[PDB]
């Protein structure tokens, strides 16, 4: 009998693991947004810098 309840602890542990992995993916993926935004901001900044240098 009791072994099935230990298998529920194992299922709970797998659930906590699945939740933790998804949360860690979200934490990294949210930081990747900042890193890619900064690259695209600099790409534009350098473009307006070039256009202004050309105008001058």
């Amino acid at each position: 009998q009791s072994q099935g309840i230990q298998q529920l602890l194992q299922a709970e542990k797998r659930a906590a693991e699945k939740v933790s992995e998804a949360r860690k993916r979200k934490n990294r993926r949210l930081k990747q947004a900042k890193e890619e935004a900064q690259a695209e901001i600099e790409q534009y900044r350098l473009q307006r810098e070039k256009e202004f240098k050309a105008k001058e």
């Binding site: 009998q1 009791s2 309840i5 230990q6 529920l8 602890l9 299922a11 709970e12």
Partner: protein, 220 residues
């Protein structure tokens, strides 16, 4: 004998110390079992001396509350309605009805559950059974450095009574249902192991409440 106890209760320093003999229950038993005029009067005298000579507020509250855990105030109302010709009965009834009229408000809290835990009187009582208690208070199982959790854990560890075990499993089920962090606290205390063992208890009422607690613990 209750005259001997009434005489013992004349000193504040004696009233502070006499608590360890567990004397209020035996007087409260006789107060229900023996309506005899003398016996009634000397219990009222002993109870008045214990409470009134307690210059320590904690001791005063404790004598008033121990009488209320014995539900003496209801019996004092029965004795107020009963015919007695003596002012030394009548006026000491009304005195104790006023002072126990404080501690009845303390007990008739959700703390009727607190006292059932403290005394070990776990049962299918209205305060165990009613959702309102847990729905408003479940977190309080952590109070006094987890005292109520420690009691329920000890009872689930060493009680012989399937009612106490099943009641405690139900109490754990509603604790987790109404306080989500309570799941983490039972998991940190390891109290789950008792419930998971009692899944194979000899009583179907315990096994049912253990399974129901495992459901409320592991299933959303």
């Amino acid at each position: 004998m209750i005259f001997s106890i009434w005489l013992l209760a004349f000193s504040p320093q004696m009233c502070e110390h006499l608590r360890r003999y567990n004397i209020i229950p035996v007087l409260s038993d006789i107060l229900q079992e023996s309506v005899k005029e003398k016996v009634t009067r000397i219990i009222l005298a002993a109870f008045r001396n214990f409470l009134e000579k307690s210059t320590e507020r904690e001791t005063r509250q404790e004598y008033a509350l121990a009488m209320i855990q014995c539900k003496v105030l209801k019996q004092l109302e029965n004795l107020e309605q009963q015919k007695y010709d003596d002012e030394d009965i009548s006026e000491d009834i009304k005195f104790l009805l006023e002072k126990l009229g404080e501690s009845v408000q303390d007990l008739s809290s959700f703390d009727e559950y607190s006292s059932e835990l403290k005394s070990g009187r776990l049962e299918w009582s209205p305060v165990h059974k009613s959702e309102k208690f847990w729905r408003e208070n479940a977190v309080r199982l952590n109070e006094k450095n987890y005292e109520l959790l420690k009691i329920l854990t000890k009872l689930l560890e060493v009680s012989d009574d399937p009612q106490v075990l099943a009641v405690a499993a139900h109490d754990v089920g509603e604790y987790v249902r109404h306080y989500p962090r309570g799941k983490r606290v039972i998991e940190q205390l390891g109290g789950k192991q008792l419930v998971m063992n009692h899944m194979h208890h000899e009583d179907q009422q315990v096994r049912y409440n253990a399974l129901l607690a495992v459901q409320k613990l592991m299933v959303h």
